[model samples]
Target: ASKKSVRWCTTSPAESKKCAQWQRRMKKVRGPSVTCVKKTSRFECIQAISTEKADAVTLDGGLVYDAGLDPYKLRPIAAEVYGTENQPQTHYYAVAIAKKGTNFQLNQLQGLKSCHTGLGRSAGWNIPMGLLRPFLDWTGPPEPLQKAVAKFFSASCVPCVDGKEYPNLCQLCAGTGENKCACSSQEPYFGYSGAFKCLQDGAGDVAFVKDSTVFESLPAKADRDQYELLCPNNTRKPVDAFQECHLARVPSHAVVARSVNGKEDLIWKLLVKAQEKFGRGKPSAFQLFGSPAGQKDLLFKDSALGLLRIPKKIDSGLYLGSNYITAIRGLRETAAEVELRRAQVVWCAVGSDEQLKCQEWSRQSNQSVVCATASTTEDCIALVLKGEADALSLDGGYIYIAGKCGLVPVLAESQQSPESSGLDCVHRPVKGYLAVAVVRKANDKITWNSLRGKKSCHTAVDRTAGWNIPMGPLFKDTDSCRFDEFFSQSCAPGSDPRSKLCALCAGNEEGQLKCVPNSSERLYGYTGAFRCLAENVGDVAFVKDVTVLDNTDGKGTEQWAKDLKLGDFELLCLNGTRKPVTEAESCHLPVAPNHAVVSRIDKVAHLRQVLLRQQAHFGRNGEDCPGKFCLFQSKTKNLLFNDNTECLAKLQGKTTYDEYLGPQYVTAIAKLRRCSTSPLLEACAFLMR
Candidate 1:
C-alpha cells in the first residue's frame, strides 16, 4: 500500500492524468480485508511473527537471544571483512530456525511476526545466499529439477554468449523444439510469406494502434527527427511517425481487436479511477506522498535533497524494463502515459488510441499477452539432446516448444516485416532458389588454389550492386578453395578460349559461354558439368539482384552444425483452457516443404516464458527480491501449463480443413498470433489488478 503515486511527482501535468484526476478526495483503495485492528496478520509483512503462536518469533530481540540461541544465527561476521569490526556486533537479517525455549505453537505459526515494519516485507534487509537458498527453495518448485531448469532458462536470458562456455557444432534437432516444424497438409499456403504473409502485408486498418512494431529506444522528438535525417529510408514510415499521448483513455488495460462500441466503458473507468485515487482528500495519495512512498520526503529530508534541483534519468525510463512491452491504446494516450510515467512511450504517434482499444476480447481479454517472460533458442536444444522434452507433442499440447529451440524442423518463407514494433524486414534465414555459381570454363586442369592466386572474381562485397553474397565459404571450402588457382594454372586447345564448356574456351562476363577468348570449346563442353567446376572446367559466378542469403550455410561450409546444442520449450496455455498447438478446426498436417511455425508457436512461447522467468528470477536474492520471486515462481510453473493438446490433437485427427492452425493464429510463432489489430493486449494490466 505504499503510495503508488511516488512515481508520478517528476511527471508533468499530463503525467498526473495516467491513473485519474482528483475531483473530490482520495479513498482507501481496498484490496484484501484488513481494517479492524491497528495491524493485522498479513502476507507482505515481517517474517518472525508475534507470541509463541509466531514461528520462532519474538518482539524483544535482547530477551529472545538471552532465552535461547539455537540454529538461527542472528549475527554473522563482525567487521566489514578481515577486521571483524567490533568483534561481536550483530548483523541485520531475518531467519526461521527453531530455538530450545521457543514453543511448538510459535514454531508452527509461520504467519506471526516478532517485529513490525510498516513498509513492504520488513524493508527486506540483505540476506546472504547461503541463508537465502533454503527460504527460496521452500517457496519454489520441487527439489532437484529446480537447478537444472533454472540453469537452462537462465542461460538463454543473456543478451549474448561467449565462445569458451559452449564450443561445439549446432545440432540440427537440438533446440528446434519441433518434430516437424511445418504445418499440416490441409491449408494450401505454407511458406513464411505464403498466406499469413499476405494478410500482414495487406494494408488494412487492424484495430491495434501502431501497426509497425519498432523496438528502437525512444528519443526526444528533435533527436528522432535527426535520426530520420540520418537514415531517411530506415526510419519510421510516414504512417507510423505520429507520437502517442494519454494512451489509456480506456480504463484498466483493454485489448486489441475491441470494436468502437466497446471502448466507452473503459474510457469511463479510467477517468473515474483516476479521480478517486488522486483527488485531494484526507488520507489521499497526495497526503501519503509526504511519507514513505514519496521519494522526495525520504531522500530530500536529508541534506542531499536541498542541493538537488533535478534528478538524473535512470534506465527505468517510463516503463522501460528490458524486453518489457507496455501495450497502450491509441497514439496520444500512449504518449501521455509515457509523459506521465516518466517512461519511454512505445507509441507510433498520430491516430486515435480510443478507437484502437479492444478490437476483440474474451473474458475481457483475460490473457493479455504478458510481459515476455522468456527467450531461449538454446535451452530447447539441450532439453532434446538430454531427452527431457520430445520434438512435438501430438496430444500433449506442448506444440509451441517447436520454435523454442530455434530449430528449423522445416523451412518456410519468412512472414511479413513486423509492423509498428520490431525490425522492418520480414526476417528469415536466406534461401536461394537459383543455383548461381561462379566457375571456370572447360579446358586445362585447374584447382581452387590456383584461382585464389589469380584475381579470381570476388562478390566485391556490395550487398546491393555487385556481391551476390559472402562467397568466402563457397569458394574457400577445403574442396573448393583452389577454384581460381585451378583455372589460371592452364589453358587448352581445340575450343574457343572465350567459350564456356568448350574444350579450349573460357567464359566471360557478358553472359557468353566461350572457348579460348573466341571460339567456343565444344569438346570441353561435353566433359564439364556443374559439379566439375572445382576441377576448373568453368568460371566462378554470382547471381545479380538477390538480397536474401539462403540459410547461413555456405555451399562450401563445414559441418560445424553437427555439434551445437539449443534450448526450446513447448507452449502451455496461460488462459487455463487448454488448446492444442494445432486443432482440427485449424488445418490438417503432414506438413509440406513451405509450412513452418503453424502449430509450432505454442512451444516457442512456453519455453520463452520459462527462459524469461528464469532469468527474471536468477540473481543475488537480497539484491533483487521481486526479481527473484518472479523468476522463481515462473520457473516453478508447469512445463505444460494450460496447453489443450489432447483436444487439439484429437481435433486434428478427426477433422480435416478445420484443423488448420495458422488461419486462426498466423505462423510467426516467436510470439502470439493476434488476429485483429484493434488495441493490442496490455501486458502491464495483468499486474495492476
Candidate 2:
C-alpha cells in the first residue's frame, strides 16, 4: 500500500498561510496528508496543477472553464454548497442589486456608478458583463472588453481592474494608498460582501453580486427590504425574488483536479474530514470557511456552508452547464463569432446522407442554417445539450430520451392525411402512424407468434416502430433482458458491432460502416429495415407502415427497390395471421407518434421560426421546390426528415416530449428502458441531478 497525500495549490500569500494552517490541523487529526503549493496567481496554480506540480485547487466557475481547456484538462471534483441548512444548493443566482429608490432599471444602467466583486468573477463580471454586452456598443477583438465596460458605466469600483488604464473603473474604490483596486480582499470594495458594502455606503448606484450577498451583508429583514433586484426586462422585484429577476444562475466555486490521477478520492476524504472538524461553527484551531476580517474568501467562499462531492461523470462543461459556458464565452474576443452562431440555426445531422442534405439546405437557405454531424442519435442529443448544435428531428422514442435530457419538441412531421384538402399541411392535425412486422410473402411459414429464434431487422435500437413497440411482446415472451438471445441472427443497428444482433446488417455499397446507427448503414431506418427483408437478409423487419408503400411498385427510385412489387410482402399480425401490407391499420403493434424537431428550451423560438420559414421555401409544395432544394425529398430514404413528411407542422401547445408522446408511449419507453438504458441517457441523468 502507498501513502496518499493531496498537494493543494494556493494563489495568494494569505491563501497559502490558510492552506498551511489546514495542513497542520489535518495532520493532528490523522486525516489524509496535506501539502501546500504557493503561486502568485490563480492561473499559475492552474498551470502548476496541469504540470503535475500540484494535485488540486478550488476555483471560481469562470476559472474552472479555463482550467478545463486544452493542456489543463482539470475537472471539478467537489462543489461549495451555500444557503441555509434546510435549503442548501451547489449553485447561486447572479443578481443585480440596487436601492429601491433608484429610478433606473437594468436596461438603463449605462452612465451609472457600479460596484463589482472583482475582475473575471462569475456574479461580479462574467454574467453581468455578458448580459449588458449589447448596450456596451463594443465590437469584439480590436478593443478589449474592459474599455467598452469603462465607457458604458460612468464610474465603477471594479477591483482587480487596471486603475491607470481605466480611471473611471476605480473611481468608486474605497481602498487607500497602494491597496486601492487590489484583487485581494485588502481592497475595501472587493468580493460579494464588499461590493454590497460599496452599494450600502452609497458609493455606487448598483452592485453586481450573488443573490445571498445582500442578506449576508445587511443581517436584518428591514435593511434587506430596502434593496431590490433589477430584472433583465427593465423591471425591479424584491431582493428575495432572484429566481425570477437574476441575470444568470451560475455553478458554485469548486475544487478542481486533473482528469487523470488527480487523487480525487484522497482529496475528497480530506475535505470531508476537514469540514467536519473546522467548517462553519466547528470549534478548531483553524477555520476552513472563515478568514481574517479585512481579508474575505481565502481558501473558499466565506459564505460556503459545506462541500458536496461532485459526481465523477460531471466534467467542467456539465458542472458549469451550457448556459453558463455560453455567458463566459460571450466575454471573450470571440463574442462576434458567438453572436453569429446564435443568429443561425445549427442543425445536428446524423451520418453522411443527412449531412449531405443538411449542407444543401444550408446553401439554399442563404446560410441561415448550418450543419453539425454526429454518428448516432444520442450523440446529436449530446451536442444539443452542450449547445454545440441547435436542433434535430427525432422519433418519438428518442423524443422521450431528449425530453428526459431537458430538450423540448418544437414541431411535428405532418404527413398527408385524408382530411388534408383545403387545410395546409402545417395546419393539419397529425395522425400517428402504424408499426408493423413485415416478412416476405414467399416465407408463409413465418408469423408474429413464430418470430422466436428467427433472423430479424430493426430500424436502430430505442426507435419507436423498429425496436420499442415490437420488442415489448418479445420482452414478455422471453421474460429476460437478453434480446440478443431471442434472435439467432439479427441486424439491430446501435447494438454492439461485434454482437450477433449486428450479424445480418449490410453496410454501405462499399461494404463499410456495417451495423452503424445512421443512414450510412445500408440496413438502417424504416426503408433500410424494409430493404433487409426485401433482399432476404432477415426473415422479419420491424418498420412503420409507410416504409413499404414508399419503396414498392415503382415508387422507389433505387435499383434494388425499383422492380419490387407490393404483393411480394405480407404483414405479420399479432393473432398469428398474415395480411397484405395495406392492412397495417388492423395488423400492427403500437401507433407511434410522428417524428418531431427537438431543441434546447432556450433555442425553441428561433429554431421554430427558422424551420417554418425554410419549409415555406423548400417544402413539398414550396415555391422553390424542383428548382432549389426540396426539404422533404431524399432519394436515399429519410435522410433528416421522413420522405413521407408533407410539412413540419406546429405542435399546437404540445411542446414538451412527454406531452407529444402521450402518457402511454412515455410509459412504454419507460418500461423498455428498464431492460437496458442507453449510456447517453445515464450520463444525462447524472448531469441533470
Candidate 3:
C-alpha cells in the first residue's frame, strides 16, 4: 500500500526531529516507512510537495488553502482531529479574549493594546482583522492594512508585520525594538500560547487567539477565568463558553500532497498505519500528536487526537472550503470593499411569507441588511447569479442546484445541543434529523413491504426528509415514476395543484394557494406534516425525526397539539414491527444534511462577515430582539434560515455543492428530478453554471 520510505517535509528543525523520531518508532510496528526533509517555510514545504522532494507536510489552514491554488495544486490527504479522544472534533473556535473588567467589546478596540499569534494566521490576524476591517475604516492595498491596524490599537504585537513601516504595531512586543514583530519563533510572542502570555503580562488589553490558548497557557482554572471573550455584539462570555460566543470557527490543519503523481493513496496508507500505532493515547514514547519537551505542536498539532483521511477527490479549494478561504482572503481586502461589504447584506427572499419576514430582518438589523424578493428558490438563485442579491439560505435540494449554478455555501444552518461538540464542526460531517415513517402506535398493518394504497403526508415536495429520502427507496423498488398507485391519497406541498398528491392538503384560510409551498398552506413543512398525522387525515407522515417530538406533548400549543402526547405516536420501522419515537437511530429513513447559506464566490468573505455580525443581532441568540425579529427562531415558519439553527457554522472544506451534499444524496435528488420538468426545475436549469 505504500513505498519503502515516504519523505516527510518539515518547516523547522524541531519539526524535522519529531518527524524522524515518529518514523523510527512507526517502523518497529511494521507500519509505513518514512524519511525526513527540512524546509524553510510553508512555501518551501509546498514546493517540496510539488517537486517530489518530500511527500507531505502538516499545514495550517491558511497554508493549505494557499498551496492548493495556482502552480502547486496540492490536496489535503488527512486532517488532524483535535479534542479529547472521547469527544474529538475537527474544528476549533478562533476567539478574541480580554481581561474580565476591560469593559470594552469588539467595537471599542480603539487605543487598546492588542496581542497576536502571527500576522497571517487564522486566530492570530486573519479572523480578528477581517472581523474588524469595517471599523478600521482604511481603504488601500495590503500595505495600508498594518497602518490602519496600528491606528486602531495604540500598541500591538503582530508577528510578521514589517516593523520598519509600522513600528507602533510592534511597540508592545516582547522583543528588542528592531527585532520586534519578527516572523519567526525568535519573537517571544508569536504563537497561541505566546499571545496569551502577552495578555497575561498586561502588555495588551485583548489577545486574538484560539479558545484553547488560555487553557494551554494557564494550568489553573482560576487564572483562565480572569479572561472573558469579547463577542461581536459588545457582549461578554466566559472563556469556556467559546462554542457559544466565539468570533469564528476555523478549519483544522491538514497533511497535504500534489494534485497529480502525488502518491496520495500511499501517503494516506502510511498516515493511517502510523497514527494507528502512534496516535494520541498510544503507549509509545514517540506519539504522533504529542509534543516533545520544550516543543509545541510539532509535525502535527499537539492537541490532535487522530488523523482523519481526506477524501481522495478533495482538492485545495475544496479542502479549505469557501468560508475559511474567505476569512483568509478577507484579511487582505481593501477597507472600502470591507465597508461596502458590511454596508448592506442583501438577502434573497422567496415566496410571500419569506419576503415579509425578510423586511422585518432588514429592519431588525438596523438597516445593515436589505431584502430582494423572488417567487421561488430557483428564482432566488437567478437573482444571486445576476448580483441582485448578496446571499440567501437554501434548502439541501435547492443548494445542490445552486452549487451547479456556481454558487458556494458560505454558512451552514446548524442545530444546537447542550452536549454537542464546539464550533470546530469541520472535524465531522454535518448531521441533520433522520427522515422516518410515522404512524399511530396502535396501527400495525403497515410494514415497509406493505405500504401500497396508504395515504401519506409529506413536509413538502423536493425536500430532503419529506420527499427525496422517503420516495427514493420506494421508487427504486417499484421502478416507476408514478407514485399515485403506491399511495391512495397524499398531501405533498409544492406539488402540482392538479395532482392527487395535493388532494388531502389544507390550503390557506381563504381556500386559495392550495398545496403551495412556503407556509401558504395550512399543512406544509415539518410542523404541517406532523399536523396531518395528528389530524388523522393521513395514515403515515413522511417527515424528519424531530417533527413528532417537536409537535407533541405540549411543546406545540396549536389546537392540534393541545391534546397530543408523544407516547401515542410510533415510527414505522422497515421490519414488520413499529418502534417508539426515540428509537429513530436504528429504525428510520435517510439522514439529511442541515440547510446552508450560499453566495457567489467573490462575495463570500464580505457576506460571511456581514452575516456573522447580523446573526449577533437577529439570530437565535440575538439579544437585540425580544419577540420582534429572530432569524433562526421563527414561530410560524422558517424564513432565510431554519428556525432551529443554533448558529451558522463554518462549512469546513465543503465549499462546493457536490462536496457539501455528498454523492449519495445528490444522486437521489437527480433520480427524483428526472420525473418532473416544472417551472422551478426549468428555472433551476436555466441558471445552470
Candidate 4:
C-alpha cells in the first residue's frame, strides 16, 4: 500500500540531503511522513507546490512576493523566527561591515573596493543595492547594472555576475579562472562568510552582509570588534549592535503553500514536530539548524530560534510588512528596467471621464503609454512620488504646488496658432494665453473699477487664468481677505459650497460635484464657468481668451449655450475699461502660462524620450498617419491629456518649476496665498517629506 506522505521541496542538494535526514528522523517518531522532491531552483519549487507535486518550500522575501501573484497565488505558511527564544522576531538585519579604521560610511562607498554575496541574493545584493540607487550615476535602461557598479568601485567580488562582460566586478574574487565569483561555496568568496572573508583578506574595503556572519566566523568578541557596521547616515556602530544600527531590517525567509486546496495545517504540523526533535536545542543527530562542514546555513538561518506559524489567510504583502515589501519590490526595478519603462509612460488620470479617455489612449498607443487613476490631480501627484506612476499634465497653479513639493515640469501644452501648422511646438517659444473677464454687452456699466457687489463666475479656485491671475492683483489692490463679500454671489465650482464661492454652481442631482476640483462637476471647467455667466446666474465670468470662442459661434449647443454668439460678449480690462471680445489680446489680465507634464527629477531623461516619441505619434500632424492615436482628438472630455494641445513642447533649459512657470507668474501665485492660505496647499505640503 502507498503510504500517505507530505512532500517536502528542496532547492539545493545540501537542502535535499537535510530533508532526507528529516524523513529518516520523522519515521522514528511515526507521527508524520515525507517524500523529498528535488527542485533545481526556488521557482521550480514554487511551480511544484502550485501543482501539488510538493507541499511547501522556504523562499527569500522577494521570491515569496513573486509566487503570490496571479496564477500561482501562494500564501506564506510559516516564517523563520530569529533572536532569543523569549523575544524572537520574523525579520533579520542587513548590515555593511568594514575594518575598524577604514573611514568608510555607507554614503562614501563609491570608488572603494566592494564585495557582495551574489547577483540576486537579498541582504547580499537586493537590499543594499536598492539603498544605493539614488547615488549611483549611470545611463539607465540602456546600461547594464553590473557595468555601472564596476565603474563605481575600483574592484568588487560580486559572485554570479557575467564576469566576461563585467570583468572589473569579478576582479577581487579568491577562486581561479572559471570558478572565480561562482554562485555556490565553490567560490572562496561567495555569501555571508565569503563576503566577510573578502574584507578579512584585504581584498575589499566594505563587505555587504547580514549581522550574523561576523559573529559566526569570529566567535571571540575581540575578533568581531575589528569590524564595524555602516549605516545610511554615514555613521558606524559595533557589529553586535546591528539591531539598533543597520541599513534595513528585512523579512526572514518564509515557507509558503498554495492558497487553495493546500495542506496548510499539515505543513505546520510537520514543521512543529520536526523542530521538536531536530531543531537547534533538540536531542538529535540530524540537526535542522546546523549545516554541513563546508556549506553555510542551507535550509534556514542557523541563528533562527524556531519556525513560527503564518496565518493561512494572510497574503504575502501583509505577511512581509509594507515597508519590507516595498524595499523588495524596488529591488526588482533596477536602473535597466527604467529604460524599458520609458516605452510605457504611466500617466495619472483623475475622475471617470479622464479614466475612460486614458483607457482609450492606452489602447491606441499599443501599450506604449499606461494610465493610473486617482480621484483628484493632488492624488495623482502622490502616486508619482511613490514611484507607482510617472507623469501627468498639470495646470500652472498645480505645477507651482508640485514644484514646491519637489516635482519639475517636463513638457508644456502648446495651443496651436494659425502660423505654426502641424505639431512643431517643441522647438519654438509658445505664446501665452490671455486671461479675460467676460461680461454680456448688456452689462455695459460693469467696468473693472466698480466690480464690487456684483455676481462673479470662475472656472475653479487656485487655477491660473480662472482664479490666481485675476484675483491676485485684485486682492493686492483691495488689501482684503473677504472674497465672499467682494463678489455678491459666485460659482467657483471647486470652492466650498457652504461659503459664497460655490453658492451658484449647478451640480448633479445629488449635488456631489459641488466642490470637486475636476471635470466631474458639470459647470466646473472653462466651459462650465462661461456657462454660469451665459445662464445669467452671474454678471461676469473669469476664463481664458478662447473660452468664449469655443462656446459661441455655433461651436457649443448645450441648453445654456444654444443661442449665444461671440459678438454678444465683452472683456473687462485691467485699465478700468471694456473692449470688444475680439480685442482680448489687449484687454486681458495676465498672460497665463500653458499646462505641462511634471515628474521627479531623477526620471527626467526617460520621460523626455517617451513623451517626445508619443507626440510624434499623437500630435496634430499625427492625424495624417490615419491609424495612430491622436491626443488632441478625444471624445470623452480629454482624459489623461488635454484635447486642445497642439504639441508637447520641450522646457527651456533645465525646465524646473521656476524656469517653466517664470518669476512673475510664481510671484503672482505667492501673493494669492498671502491673501488666504488654502487647505489644498497645506495638504500638498503635508503629503511631501
On TM-score, the leading prediction is 2
TM-score of each: 0.19, 0.63, 0.49, 0.45
User: What is the Cα-based TM-score of model 4?
Assistant: 0.45
CA lDDT, candidate 1, residue 443 = 24
lDDT of 4 by residue, 1-689 (tens): 22467888888898898888778879888757877888899899999999888888888777887888777889888878777767666666788999998787877888999888888777888778766765567554445666768788898999988788888688899988679888789999998999999999999999999878998989998898787898554678899878646766676778889888788788788888878878889887778788887876777777777887764435665455333444555445655663465346788988876777777777877777788987788767766754567788898878987787557888888878534565356887766888888888888768887787888888988777887866777676556666667887888876886887877777774456665667666667898778878878879988988889888886765566778788888877888888877889789887787788898654576788887877677667675335665676666576566767778888777466877776656766777776766544564443221
**Which residue segments of model 3 deviate by more than 4 Å?**
1-42, 51-55, 81-91, 99-103, 115-122, 137-146, 156-204, 213-228, 233-236, 259-262, 277-305, 311-324, 331-390, 396-689
lDDT at residue 480 of model 1 (Cα atoms): 30
lDDT by residue for model 3 (1-689), tens: 33567888888889888986877876777877888888988789899878878888888777887788788888878877866657777777789999988789888888899999988677898788866766776675656667878888998888888777887677777876555667777788889987888899999999999878888788799887788998655688998988656776666788888777878777788888877777767778778778878998888887777887765545565455443555665577766666665557788888877887878777776777888897777767766764558788888877877776557889888777534544433234567667788887666777776778888899998777788877876776445688666788899998878788998998986468899996779888987788888888888898877888878888775578887888798887766677877888888876677788988765787678887777776665566646567766554686667765678877888776877876656766666766754444453332211
Query: Which residue runs of candidate 4 sit more than 4 Å off their true CA positions?
Result: 1-128, 131-152, 155-339, 417-423, 436-463, 476-480, 486-589, 623-625, 667-684, 687-689
RMSD in Å for candidate 2, one decimal? 9.7
Best candidate (score: lDDT): 2
Model 2 residue 603 CA deviation (Å) reads 2.6
lDDT scores in order: 0.22, 0.83, 0.76, 0.76
True lDDT of residue 595, candidate 3: 85
- Give me the displacement of residue 22 in model 3, in angstroms: 8.1
lDDT comparing candidate 4 with the true structure: 0.76
Expressed as tens digits, the lDDT of each residue in 489-584 for candidate 1 is 223323234432133234443246543322243212212221122333324323221111211123322342123121110111212222222231
Candidate 2 lDDT, 1-689, residue by residue in tens: 23468888888789998998888888998887888899988899899989888988999888898899888999999888877888877776788999999889977999999999998777898788876666677787667789999999999999999999999899899998899989998998899999999999998999999888877788889898898898755678998888656777677788999998888898999989988888887886488998886877987998989997887756777677666777776666466676686679999999998988999999889999999998889878878877779989998878888888767889899876533544477877777878788999878768887767789989897788898877866675344677787788889989888888888887777477988998878888997788888888889999988889888887764577888888888888877888988988788776788889998766777788888899988987778987799988885678898877788999996866877886646755776886867766776665532
Native RMSD of candidate 3 (Å) = 14.8
